[PDB]
Amino acid sequence: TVTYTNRVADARLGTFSQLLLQWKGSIYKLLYSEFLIFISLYFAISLVYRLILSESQRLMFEKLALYCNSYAELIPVSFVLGFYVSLVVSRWWAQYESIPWPDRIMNLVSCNVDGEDEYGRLLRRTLMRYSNLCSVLILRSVSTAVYKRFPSMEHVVRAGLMTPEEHKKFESLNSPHNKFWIPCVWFSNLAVKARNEGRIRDSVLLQGILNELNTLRSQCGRLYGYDWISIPLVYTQVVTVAVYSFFLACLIGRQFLDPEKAYPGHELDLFVPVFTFLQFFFYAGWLKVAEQLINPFGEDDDDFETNWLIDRNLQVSLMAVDEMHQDLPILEKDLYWNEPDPQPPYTAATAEYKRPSFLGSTF
Amino acid sequence: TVTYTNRVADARLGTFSQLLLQWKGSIYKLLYSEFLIFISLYFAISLVYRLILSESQRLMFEKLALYCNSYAELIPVSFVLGFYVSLVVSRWWAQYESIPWPDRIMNLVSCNVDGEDEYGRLLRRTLMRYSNLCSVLILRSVSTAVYKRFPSMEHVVRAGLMTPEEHKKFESLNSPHNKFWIPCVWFSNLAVKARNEGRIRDSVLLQGILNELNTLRSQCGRLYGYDWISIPLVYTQVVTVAVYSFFLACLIGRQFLDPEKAYPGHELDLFVPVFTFLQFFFYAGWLKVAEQLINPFGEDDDDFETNWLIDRNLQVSLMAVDEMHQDLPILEKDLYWNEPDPQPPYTAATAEYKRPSFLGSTF
Amino acid sequence: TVTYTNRVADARLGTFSQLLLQWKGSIYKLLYSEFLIFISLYFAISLVYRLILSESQRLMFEKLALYCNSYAELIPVSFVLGFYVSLVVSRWWAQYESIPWPDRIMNLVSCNVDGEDEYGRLLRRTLMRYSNLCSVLILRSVSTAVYKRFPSMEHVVRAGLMTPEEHKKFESLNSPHNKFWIPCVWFSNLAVKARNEGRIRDSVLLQGILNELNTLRSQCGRLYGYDWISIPLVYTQVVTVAVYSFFLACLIGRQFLDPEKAYPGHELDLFVPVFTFLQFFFYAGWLKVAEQLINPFGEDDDDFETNWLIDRNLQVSLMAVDEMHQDLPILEKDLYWNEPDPQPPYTAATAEYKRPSFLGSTF
Amino acid sequence: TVTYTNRVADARLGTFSQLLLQWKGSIYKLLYSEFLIFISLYFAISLVYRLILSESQRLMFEKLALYCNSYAELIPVSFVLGFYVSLVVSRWWAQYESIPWPDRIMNLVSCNVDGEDEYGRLLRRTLMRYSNLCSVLILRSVSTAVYKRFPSMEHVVRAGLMTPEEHKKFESLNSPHNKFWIPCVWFSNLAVKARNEGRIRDSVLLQGILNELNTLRSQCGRLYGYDWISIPLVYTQVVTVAVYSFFLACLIGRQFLDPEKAYPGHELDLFVPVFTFLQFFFYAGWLKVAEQLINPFGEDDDDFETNWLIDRNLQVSLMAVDEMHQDLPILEKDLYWNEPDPQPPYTAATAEYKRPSFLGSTF
Amino acid sequence: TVTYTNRVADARLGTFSQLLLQWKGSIYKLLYSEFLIFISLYFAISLVYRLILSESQRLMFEKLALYCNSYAELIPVSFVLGFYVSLVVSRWWAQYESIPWPDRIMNLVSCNVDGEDEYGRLLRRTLMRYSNLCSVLILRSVSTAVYKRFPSMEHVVRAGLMTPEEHKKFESLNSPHNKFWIPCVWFSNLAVKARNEGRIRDSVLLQGILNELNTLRSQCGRLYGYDWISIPLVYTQVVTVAVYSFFLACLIGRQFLDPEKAYPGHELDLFVPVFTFLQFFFYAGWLKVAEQLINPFGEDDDDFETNWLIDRNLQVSLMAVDEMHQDLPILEKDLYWNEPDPQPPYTAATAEYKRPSFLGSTF
Ligand SMILES: [Ca+2]
Ligand SMILES: [Ca+2]
Ligand SMILES: [Ca+2]
Ligand SMILES: [Ca+2]
Ligand SMILES: [Ca+2]
């Protein structure tokens, strides 16, 4: 995504002021086309009122501009954007926590599957390759950034995520439904086959591996759930009527009428509404928070970088069960072997952050 | 339901604008009958004011139209729709997560119940058939889309979800209460009977199966809970008084009075209120979000497709414990057997999504 | 409670319109006495203004009616009802999920406590009778609907929930505090006594039973917590001042003044305020949502039917560990023994609900 | 706290009306001193305007009173009280659920630690005494009601929560940080020492005890977390500026100006503002909800009664592992030994609460 | 952070009034520079209007000041600050609960890893040193207060958190991604190596240690998640446009116009706006709640004191597995050996807090 966490660590003077100058993933990149439509529809109405209309027709238009200005109220639109965006953002973070990480299975496979030989090394690599394949097959079904990377099953085989003997089995299992559950069943049968040859010692270690598989299966079941059960379409169509009804009234009610007749509220002619345009960046920009996060697996600048994460999870999983299985650093006494009060040193810029120990608020 | 997740992946120009043109499951299909009642009651009042009423009676009506326009305020109605719909939508997603999925039991039954013979294959099919039957009997009690598919117990037997010898036992258990708990007790006794014949090796594998049964029993207990304990009727009757009190005031307060008397606020006669009708699509359409989601197991276009999901869960469960029990693809070295840095390839349209690795915000 | 889930399954025309006509548990049964107080205090003021007051006193009253009409504003009252009712309803559903269900213990006791003889059958009935007694003793402490059914310990013994030999032990345990924890300790010692005679095979099955006891103990600890720690009284007294301050201003500010003096806002005399009474059904009815749900174990029409649920949990628990212990239907091949694509049939009214399988949004 | 759950069980007429008459823990006991400051500052301004000021100075004051009345608006203050109190109340209930209860450890220690002799009885009393001591040492650090009961370690020894041989060990462990974690480490080593002498049979029962210890350790870690990480001080200082800015404007803007000049809005002189004082009970009373719950372990009338709960948890824990270890009532056939349909009897006042069994909404 | 929990324990008179006088971490330290910009831009406009502008130009400016005063409305800005700060604060507390604590692993390592000799003591110190190193490597990636303490890997070795033989292994593991997962894999292999030499007795104790490792791995995975997936930048840029659009209108609309022309609303010249400046402390100060909590690991006065917590977790973990392994106080009969009703004594200031036991609300 767009990470600006380093910029906003402290509350300086230009903390949020400098974030308005950024372009990538900003409000300006989203509202670029909607602004020029709103400018062009605004000044077309103003040039008709200032050049084209006759005197009897300008009086007819000024009664229309005072009628539209009454319904152009800001308060009830801010309600329905507030409860809708709070629904989208709560669904947004819940889909990030549903993205499966191999690291809980990675710890147990790398220690409880014995064997330093060729067959035991091959057994640990195949277990973790199924756990990655059970995650690639659910991300390519829900993320357009992954589906363009893997458009077919042949692209999965060419990437090494599925050997060609597995694809021959994967096609013979004739099922019309989605097949993301299949590598998470091959994980269960290979782990039990590992137990029956003595690669796992006890049943408690086998059940501990199978419990972390079903955690990863429930993670993939949530991503299938948020993708299939969208936000209700009637509740998306409400909040986009109310935003477009507000901006329809502001095309007519926020014109600059002729001050020589001196209507109440239009005493000054300024040729460009500064504060009406700033409400367009406010209200339409707070709708673009909903348009960008309603599917966080697309190709926006703030959607999830899932193509990166597949490349991370493949490299890390095949490194911890292959190059780190029973390969430990040599045990040695640390620096605090005889010191019961360890005091790690401070640098110069951090030495004012030495706080006394918090004993409790009652002291 | 109605899935539009593919349309709203990116934040383009016509992202939410194109969703207003869709018909199925939209605001127009719900508000079709309420709109024509509101049009017919509106213009009946206008034709009486413009044709039927005398001059002394029009003056009596104009004082009524200015009285009703004061109570036709929009702000406090938007409060009580906001907190009510946020209750319905939070209950809406919590009932989707209560729909039981067999896949956690499906992994453990397909690996820990040994036997490739006829009796062991028959034992795994009967365990998963009880877990599906314990879900069909709770969905036909809470979903009108399932009850019309299975109106009696005889339809369950004809669908193969219950053998006729089981229905003879299911009727002899004389109980006045709902009997969805019975197949989840038959699962427990058959799994212990499987252990005593040596089909399950250790007690830890038996307890791991029985823990995933009680998870599925707690899933069925929530669907029984949301169906029995509705949203409070006094709290549904409040939010439908406040919407109908608003539209009652807008039938009289939003008339176009005679501009020749020039009341403040009614200076223009336009013969059709454009912005009053757009508030009808806003407020009554944001009540139809509550009317459609208050029971998401009915037959609306956005209620849950549970008839599909029974057909999925029956086909997948009897495929993973029958055709996939100890039927593995042949183990083979993958492409990254000697490469400690796996780099899966990118397509042409995805090659700009190569990001450097996120090391942390402090770097 | 009042279940109307069958009525609101679909979004028809008269979906929420027909719910206003229902009486039981409605807004009309709650606001019956408060409405007649508000009518009688309203028209008493109006008859004094129209018959009793002199001309100099009516002028003094009209300045009071314009003063009270300024403070009779609707917006800030709707805030504090919104956040207060959202607190009550979140506490309301959290107390339903704290009501203990025996069904998770019922599965494990009915399969892991061996013995088809007289002593083993008596052992399973006593385990489940303690789990029901540990729930009756916490419901009679928190629910007035249960305490009127069981006013003393003698009513518990006459209902068969406690044998007279257990009450002799239950009184000798001299403790001033509440004794709902005692049957959940007798469950632990009887389950360990069952293990030492060989009725439970392994320690893993014993710990699986004891884990589901402590789940039920934590359920009873929440019901003790919500009953002892109420909503703060200062926060209940705020929201009932603001509702009564609003209705105090509407008794004077919403009078119909004399239109012959033509005050701004009171141009019409109508003898009965229609929209002021509809705000009484709105605001006072949205306070009755809080008055009814602040203790959902009382005797309102929408409080929890806990007297029913004790009769269910006693009949079901003593049926699954007695008549269903190792009493299985005969294993038999189902209809889909040779069909790898099960297609359960559809009825006539459900045949349009055949959907193609959802493969994912990217397809 | 103040428990009024018995009063508000039903929705009668005077349900919330009678709660305004209560004194203890009410809005009147909190706002007693702030009201007399607000009365004395109000009528001091009024007596200066009515007696002290000259004619040219009263005209200068009336322009100030109309200026302050414009900023005395109620709507934006109600926002920031609503989101702040909803933060406090969500943190309030989360600290009650963090208060550790011994009852989950109490079940497992009372059954799995064998021995009816003197040493086995002494072993169970010492395990539960560490679990109470690990809770007293965290409550005296976070609760001022407990710290005044136990000001030093010597008061803990005199209360019998720590034997003098344990305090000699508790002081030799030289650590500057808070030492609430020490009795939860002594519990782990004594439970393993119990296993190695044969007092606990299997490792599964030992791990089941140690899992319920770490649950209680995570409960004490939350109370340390809510006490150390307060609500942000900048977010407390915002909501108390906005309340005091509102009441500063109401000291001048809500004066009764002279009606002989007849300003718009001040047409009547009434000598005491009734509705301005009722907004003081509303807004300042809804700030006292935040002032009382921001530390629920203090000595307010609605803070948590934790001194009571230590006396409960000490008496109950040493009663269930001492007088109830393997002391069971005699097993006997209950009343429903031969009746498969148990029907417990109803009293006279409860016989109308016989409901038919809820089969599901689709029936 | 800034802990004021001792001050606000009771609801006294000056409870929240005294918090405005505090400087550290307050609203005044954050708004110090933004206030002087707002003062200097305000009085520059006022001195131009009072000294520089001509008579025809002052009339042109007064029409601009009445135009800007209409858009300077407070209500819709308070919506979008309310939903944005409620998002930040919910993410704020969720990152505190993601900070890993060693104390759950600390209990199990200190009891289940046998051996009082030199090798067994060295084995327990190395297990807990990996669990601290797996937390330092994730905090130095997300916290600028920790990264300035440990700028490189060489500072980790000099602090004794990593022996130089481990850094030689830590560099040979060639991976471009972040390496916080590596010490949580070394923990798994050393714990299994401990089992194979007989330092851990059974597999159930080994799986209990490995389950508490993966809990700590999921804690570190959340801190990596909140740091990488920020609040959406478009949703931060909306709420800072709306605050700055409000203050732009208040620089012109809140001027004091000339009262000799007597515009409606500007009847009095007061030379300094008191209530406009108090809205600056309100609105801009309620934006500084968001600016300070959006990254709670920085160096603000209310960000998390994580440098302290590393020094605590290092001292406590190496004290409980070294000086407290099987070092128990001597078992002895407590004071309540023969008293079945323990009554711990009360002090003088706490003796009025003797409450009778809460039996339940129905009594
Ligand atoms: Ca997107
Ligand atoms: Ca529906
Ligand atoms: Ca009630
Ligand atoms: Ca307090
Ligand atoms: Ca910060």
Numbering used by the authors:
A (entry chain C), B (entry chain B), C (entry chain A), D (entry chain E), E (entry chain D): 2 to 364
The authors write:
To begin studying the structural basis of gating in BEST1, we determined a 3.1 Å resolution cryo-EM structure of Ca2+-bound BEST1 without an antibody (the same construct used for X-ray studies, comprising residues 1–405 of chicken BEST1, and termed BEST1405). The conformation of the channel is indistinguishable from the previously published X-ray structure. Therefore, this cryo-EM structure also represents a Ca2+-bound inactivated state. This result indicates that antibody binding does not distort the channel from a native conformation and reflects a satisfying correspondence of structures determined using X-ray crystallography and cryo-EM methodologies. The receptor is on the cytosolic surface of the channel and the binding of the inactivation peptide to it allosterically controls the conformation of the neck from a distance.
The diameter of the pore varies along its length and contains two constrictions, the ‘neck’ and the ‘aperture’, both of which are lined by hydrophobic amino acids.
